[PDB]
Design a protein around this nucleic acid. Structure first.
Ligand SMILES: [Zn+2]
Ligand SMILES: [Zn+2]
Lengths: 98, 48, 85, 87, 44, 471, 116, 16
RNA sequence: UUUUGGCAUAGUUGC
């Protein structure tokens, strides 16, 4: 049962690889130009922040362009109608069809 | 493609443009093809 | 107003105040306006927020704040008592 | 996830080296988190209670930082190591 | 019109073209004052 | 010989890629990693990819390694076919120019003075500016007073002027620009541009004769068309075979008493019928008017559509309405109630026409729109016209025979003969009836009753206005 | 060598004789890298303006003309490697052409275009 | 392990 | 003096 831990770890691994690619290309630009890149400008924080925010915002899980086969239905609007309903939604576990 | 004919452009580039036009019209009439994958809209959905 | 917005929906607008918002504690039907808001044509036209046209209620609490960008945005909680029927 | 898996993922990531020649090495060493903070239009930090985020349509999120060690080798028998802390 | 700061209850008027801010707290949530229109209730 | 292989490259950076690969070749021609490719081609007008000359694809892949710009072609490559290798290098090709870059892209510019230094040429242009009023556009004449008034970067030497990024102008912009930044061949401006600063037209269905040759005097209907040497396919009279004629051998001949339209000239757009076919002076009369129109044979086409030859009510001012009597490029010819034809701008207001309006003729007979009415008194006495618009004391009459103002005139109506409740949204209080005690707001109001949304309960009900008392 | 290669994209001009593409600075400082001995535009800007073209289409990075069918079609096989132009708009005056012909160099036009 | 920072150690670089 | 207005995949819920 992957809880929030392995879930966020997997998505963080993906987004961190993407950020590594981004900083690689951005550093390569100035390094081939013949000067030192600004490391503060090398990073673009929207890969991780807006990425996780997206993946929780719509329920899609995986890369945003990979939505064709990226499994969705992980992050859901919290059931706020009764205290018992909120508890039951907190502890819910879903088996994919697969 | 019309400009390429009016340019007297090369045959292979014209043929590849014709291939692209073939794929695009086939996708317009049918974006569920068995051949080339589905065309997207630069947003991330196949077109209706 | 009809004299400044040359495109509008037929309804009452006097419930709102000068800020284009309704004061809490006003008893409202589904066809009323809760947020007086309008866009400038490239005079102006309305895109104000009405209530869901199946109910009535009381505008319970109107909160005003700034969004993540910093634009003035408001939430309005509407009460409606429900007697068993 | 926060206390172990983020840090161990960062450790498991390989170092990055680039060639123009100026050779480079990029290393990520330690991770840092503050509490959920909030910046207004003026960019002023403040603590963000979750009710404020729920009310103002914000995201109850904390900033993340990593110390980044950039060691550049100009092929003159030298390794200029500069560390950027809390990036 | 008049609004109440959501933290320290500072009543304050705000114009139609200035961002909201508590005049003694700096807080950035405001609530409208109660309507001054006659409101009545049948007790049924 | 080796074969050319296509490699996808970054768009707009092919020549830089070729320079980089040549530098790489020279930098590794003596090493243990030699580039075994032979040559690199980055054509000028072929944008997006380049060609590499080699005997193998493995040579291509091992040579382009280390080049990021070609990474989209790194995994796979496509060989140019053997028969199309010539086509890689096959290349084809007080005046007026057109500037390339800037906001004046593809704008006609008159070459005023050519600098012999061969760096720039002085060009006369029409400014596409807002005079520093919107920015913090179409062509219009350069207004000196406006940009003097608005201020900003502006320097004045009478008609001579400097403004907004060293733009030079006089009376019209007059600025220097590089010849490489303009096109010095193939502009061909129009007559309108001249004011600012042979042809063949054969259509299918048209009838053409033969003016010379062994097939002279054969009238036939056009089927096809081409540019210069048409090799036409005309369906002649009493001939099932299809013959051949170029553009020069034909002429737009037409028998009398047939539909004719004018393709160009002063008489363009008007339809009609040709009467007598002289040698070259073909005389016709329009469907609108009965005036002689003399045209060349080439200025006629066979088109069977009806003539177009509209009539909208507009407000000249709140005191006087107006009826459009001609539609023009930038103005309306409007005929008003007074009978005075005026010429007004596009930005009069459209009045709500009242098609059910009733007017009285001179004999106390009710008359409505589309009614044929005779004018017995007034300046237009004797005429008879169809009513199209109405006023309190005026009526506009259309008449096809009258060739003036599209047949539209106006006469006074007496010189013709036929041939919101205040209670709405008001807080109220039920002072009478079963609903006494309560408070509500008036949604709808009538003469007798009024809807009230009841504040107390979740309903709205109707009550007599006598039962209401305002707060 | 690298002296033949242009340094930047601005004011690229193609020669009228051998279609050699270079900047105006390189024509001013080096002349023609193939046939300056037959033209002598080094040390004179007006000679460059008379002997080079402001309008060209196509560019070839001729690296190995000895084994290039491209050079066979463009007739640049016996020249040195460099940046050549495929089609060149322009023409030398009659004096320079006559002087070249008196030295045994007939002027073949590099305008290989299909003019309509 | 991941270290914690107090709000006073957050420099005002996010505004610059 | 007359009102308008979106398509989408995903998620949950109800016989
Ligand atoms: Zn406060
Ligand atoms: Zn030369």
């Amino acid at each position: 049962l992957d809880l929030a831990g392995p879930l966020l770890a997997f998505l963080f691994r993906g987004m961190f690889k993407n950020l590594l690619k981004e900083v690689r290309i951005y550093a390569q630009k100035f390094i081939d130009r013949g000067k030192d890149f600004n490391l503060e400008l090398a990073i673009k924080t929207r890969i991780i922040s807006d990425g996780l925010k997206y993946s929780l915002a719509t329920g899609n899980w995986g890369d945003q362009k990979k939505a064709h086969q990226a499994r969705a239905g992980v992050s859901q609007v919290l059931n706020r109608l009764t205290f018992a309903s909120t508890l039951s939604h907190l502890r819910r576990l879903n088996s994919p069809i697969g | 493609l019309r400009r390429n004919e009016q340019n007297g452009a090369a045959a292979h580039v014209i043929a590849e443009d014709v291939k692209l036009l073939q794929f695009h019209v086939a996708t317009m009439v049918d974006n569920e093809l068995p051949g080339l994958p589905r065309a997207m809209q630069k947003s991330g959905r196949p077109l209706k | 107003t009809r004299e400044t917005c040359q495109g509008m929906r037929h309804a009452i607008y006097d419930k709102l105040d000068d800020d284009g918002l309704i004061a809490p504690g006003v008893r409202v039907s589904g066809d009323d306006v809760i947020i007086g808001k309008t866009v400038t044509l490239p005079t102006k036209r309305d895109c104000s927020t009405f209530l869901r046209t199946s109910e009535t209620g009381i505008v319970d609490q109107v909160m005003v704040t700034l969004n993540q960008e910093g634009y003035k945005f408001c939430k309005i909680r509407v009460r409606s008592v429900r007697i068993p029927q | 996830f926060i206390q172990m898996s983020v840090q161990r993922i960062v450790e498991d990531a390989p170092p990055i080296d680039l060639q123009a020649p100026p050779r480079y090495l990029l290393k990520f060493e330690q991770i840092y988190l503050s509490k959920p903070t909030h910046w207004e239009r003026d960019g002023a930090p403040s603590p963000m209670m979750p009710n404020e985020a729920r009310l103002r349509n914000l995201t109850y999120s904390a900033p993340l930082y990593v110390d980044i060690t950039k060691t550049v080798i100009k092929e003159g028998e030298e390794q200029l190591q500069t560390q950027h802390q809390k990036t | 019109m008049i609004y109440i700061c959501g933290e320290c209850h500072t009543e304050n008027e705000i114009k139609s073209r200035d961002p909201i801010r508590c005049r003694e707290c700096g807080y950035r949530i405001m609530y409208k004052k109660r309507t001054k229109r006659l409101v009545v209730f049948d007790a049924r | 010989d080796p074969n050319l292989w296509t490699v996808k490259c970054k768009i707009g950076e092919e020549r830089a890629t070729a320079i980089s690969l040549m530098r790489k070749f020279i930098a590794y021609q003596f090493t243990d990693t030699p580039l075994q490719i032979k040559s690199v081609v980055a054509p000028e007008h072929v944008k997006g990819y380049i060609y590499v000359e080699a005997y193998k694809q493995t040579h291509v892949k091992q040579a382009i390694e280390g080049v990021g710009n070609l990474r989209l072609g790194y995994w796979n490559q496509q060989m140019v076919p053997i028969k199309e290798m010539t086509d890689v290098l096959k290349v084809v090709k007080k005046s007026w120019v057109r500037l390339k870059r800037g906001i004046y892209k593809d704008d006609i510019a008159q070459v005023d003075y050519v600098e012999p230094s061969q760096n720039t040429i002085s060009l006369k242009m029409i400014p596409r500016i807002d005079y520093d009023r919107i920015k913090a556009p179409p062509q219009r004449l350069f207004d000196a007073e406006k940009i003097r008034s608005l201020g900003g970067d502006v320097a004045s030497d009478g008609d001579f002027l400097i403004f907004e990024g060293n733009r030079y102008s006089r009376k019209f912009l007059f600025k220097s620009f590089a010849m490489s930044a303009v096109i010095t061949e193939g502009v061909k401006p129009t007559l309108s541009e001249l004011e600012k600063f042979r042809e063949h037209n054969f259509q299918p269905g048209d009838n053409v004769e033969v003016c010379e040759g062994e097939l002279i005097n054969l009238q036939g209907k056009i089927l096809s068309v081409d540019g210069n040497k048409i090799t036409i396919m005309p369906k002649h009279e009493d001939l099932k075979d299809m013959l051949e004629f170029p553009a020069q051998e034909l002429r737009k001949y037409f028998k009398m008493g047939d539909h004719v339209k004018v393709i160009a000239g002063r008489f363009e757009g008007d339809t009609g019928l040709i009467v007598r076919v002289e040698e070259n002076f073909v005389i016709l009369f329009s469907d609108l008017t009965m005036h002689e129109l003399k045209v060349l044979p080439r200025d006629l086409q066979l088109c069977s559509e009806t003539a177009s030859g509209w009539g909208e009510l507009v407000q000249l001012d709140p005191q006087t309405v107006g009826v459009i009597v001609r539609l023009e490029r930038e103005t309306f010819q409007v005929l008003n109630m007074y009978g005075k034809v005026v010429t007004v701008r596009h930005q009069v207001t459209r009045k709500k026409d009242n098609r059910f309006a009733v007017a009285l003729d001179s004999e106390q007979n009710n008359i409505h729109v589309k009614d044929i009415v005779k004018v017995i008194d007034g300046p237009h006495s004797g005429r008879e016209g169809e009513i199209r618009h109405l006023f309190r004391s005026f009526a506009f009459l259309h008449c096809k025979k009258l060739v003036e103002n599209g047949g539209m005139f106006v006469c006074k109506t007496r010189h013709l003969v036929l041939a919101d409740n205040e209670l709405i949204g008001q807080t109220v209080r039920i002072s009478q009836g079963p609903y006494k005690g309560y408070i509500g707001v008036v949604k709808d109001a009538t003469e007798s009753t009024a809807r009230v949304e009841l504040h107390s309960t979740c309903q709205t009900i109707s009550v007599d206005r006598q039962r209401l008392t305002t707060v | 060598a690298l002296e033949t290669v242009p340094k930047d994209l601005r004011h690229l001009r193609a020669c009228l004789l051998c279609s050699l593409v270079k900047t105006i600075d390189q024509f001013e400082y080096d002349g023609c890298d193939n046939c300056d001995a037959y033209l002598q535009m080094k040390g004179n800007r007006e000679m460059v303006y008379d002997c080079t073209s402001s309008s060209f289409d196509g560019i070839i990075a001729m690296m190995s003309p000895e084994d290039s069918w491209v050079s066979k079609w463009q007739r640049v096989s016996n020249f040195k490697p460099g940046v050549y132009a495929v089609s060149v708009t322009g023409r030398l005056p009659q004096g320079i052409v006559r002087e070249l012909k008196s030295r045994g160099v007939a002027y073949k036009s590099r305008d290989t275009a299909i003019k309509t | 392990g991941v270290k914690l920072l107090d709000i006073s150690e957050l420099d005002m670089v996010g505004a610059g």
